[PDB]
Amino acid sequence: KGPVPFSHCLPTEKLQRCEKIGEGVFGEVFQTIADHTPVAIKIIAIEGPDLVNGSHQKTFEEILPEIIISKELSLLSGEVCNRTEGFIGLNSVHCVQGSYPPLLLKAWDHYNSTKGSANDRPDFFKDDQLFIVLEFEFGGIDLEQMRTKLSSLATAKSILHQLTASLAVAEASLRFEHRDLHWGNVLLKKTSLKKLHYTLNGKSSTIPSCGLQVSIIDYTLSRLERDGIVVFCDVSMDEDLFTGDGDYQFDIYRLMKKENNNRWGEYHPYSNVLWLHYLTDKMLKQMTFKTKCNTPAMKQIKRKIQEFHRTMLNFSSATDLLCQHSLFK
Ligand SMILES: Nc1ncnc2c1ncn2[C@@H]1O[C@H](COP(=O)(O)O)[C@@H](O)[C@H]1O
Numbered sequence: 001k002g003p004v005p006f007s008h009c010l011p012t013e014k015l016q017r018c019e020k021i022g023e024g025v026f027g028e029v030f031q032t033i034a035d036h037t038p039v040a041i042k043i044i045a046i047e048g049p050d051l052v053n054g055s056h057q058k059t060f061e062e063i064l065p066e067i068i069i070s071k072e073l074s075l076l077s078g079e080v081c082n083r084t085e086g087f088i089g090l091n092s093v094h095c096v097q098g099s100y101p102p103l104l105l106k107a108w109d110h111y112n113s114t115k116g117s118a119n120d121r122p123d124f125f126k127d128d129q130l131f132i133v134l135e136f137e138f139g140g141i142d143l144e145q146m147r148t149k150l151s152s153l154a155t156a157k158s159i160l161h162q163l164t165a166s167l168a169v170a171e172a173s174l175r176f177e178h179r180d181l182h183w184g185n186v187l188l189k190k191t192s193l194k195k196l197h198y199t200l201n202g203k204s205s206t207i208p209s210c211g212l213q214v215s216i217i218d219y220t221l222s223r224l225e226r227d228g229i230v231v232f233c234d235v236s237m238d239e240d241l242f243t244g245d246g247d248y249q250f251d252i253y254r255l256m257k258k259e260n261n262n263r264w265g266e267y268h269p270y271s272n273v274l275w276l277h278y279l280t281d282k283m284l285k286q287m288t289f290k291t292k293c294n295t296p297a298m299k300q301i302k303r304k305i306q307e308f309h310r311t312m313l314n315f316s317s318a319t320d321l322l323c324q325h326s327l328f329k
Pocket residue numbers: 021022023024026029040042088136137138139140141142183184185187217218
């Protein structure tokens with residue numbers, strides 16, 4: 001009958017176990033336990049007139065595309081013709097109303113002490129504030145936090161292959177573009193699987209895991225088609241999105257705008273190639289590997305990833321990269 005109280009999504013025990021694990025301008029991400037297993041809870045303030053982390057809160061209408069796309073992408077793990085585990089599972093979505101729970105404030109504070117925060121301490125929300133609460137599968141640790149923790153160049157290659165395959169499957173199934181695949185949005189989790197499986201237009205293939213499962217998250221800017229309807233975030237009048245600096249990330253928003261001539265409902269899967277290029281650049285420039293790069297085999301992978309960086313912009317889509325680029329043969 002409209003929203004629910006926080007206690008509906010976060011009963012005492014689950015709340016007591018919350019720890020903050022990440023953030024953005026959108027809001028806040030906490031980890032807790034459900035059914036003997038970690039879960040990730042994304043909490044987004046909506047519909048309020050107050051500026052939050054420097055931005056207006058989204059309306060439900062502005063948030064709805066992320067909710068829809070989160071649900072669609074969550075289905076790809078079981079779909080027959082086009083299948084991948086390379087996105088993230090969605091457990092539930094709720095509209096919650098209330099002030100921030102004190103335990104979540106203490107968890108926010110703990111994070112701000114240890115890691116620091118770009119957001120405002122969430123102690124100003126009133127009893128009538130609305131939030132969207134998205135409960136996700138716990139996907140591991142983000143690539144930015146792993147920038148000194150990858151084992152080898154083989155791991156780098158595996159991550160790029162996994163990312164490309166995931167995006168290709170979503171392209172084939174949904175005419176998907178991610179549109180904000182910064183390295184905070186690539187999650188790494190240890191797996192005992194040696195080979196990872198995907199199906200692309202009815203053809204199943206595998207990818208050497210190198211011990212990790214990659215999960216792509218955060219569909220705040222994403223675009224896809226579902227039942228002939230294009231679901232997307234229209235950023236045609238956003239100015240600030242295109243005036244960032246200090247990181248190649250901020251160039252990608254401008255490069256996408258160039259590619260699509262500011263028509264965000266159209267399908268331009270080249271944007272996926274652009275994000276993969278930005279990620280390749282991070283691997284080559286902002287990362288150090290536990291085993292360094294000390295053997296002929298590892299040195300050759302590095303040269304191959306460098307060549308990928310220098311050639312991949314001449315491919316039309318994640319699908320084109322997957323199916324045609326030498327790095328993945
Ligand atoms: N499903 C998830 N599993 C694990 N960590 C997550 C998940 N979703 C978000 N995070 C963390 O929260 C950060 C911000 O989330 P996002 O706003 O979606 O980029 C990410 O960089 C991750 O560190």
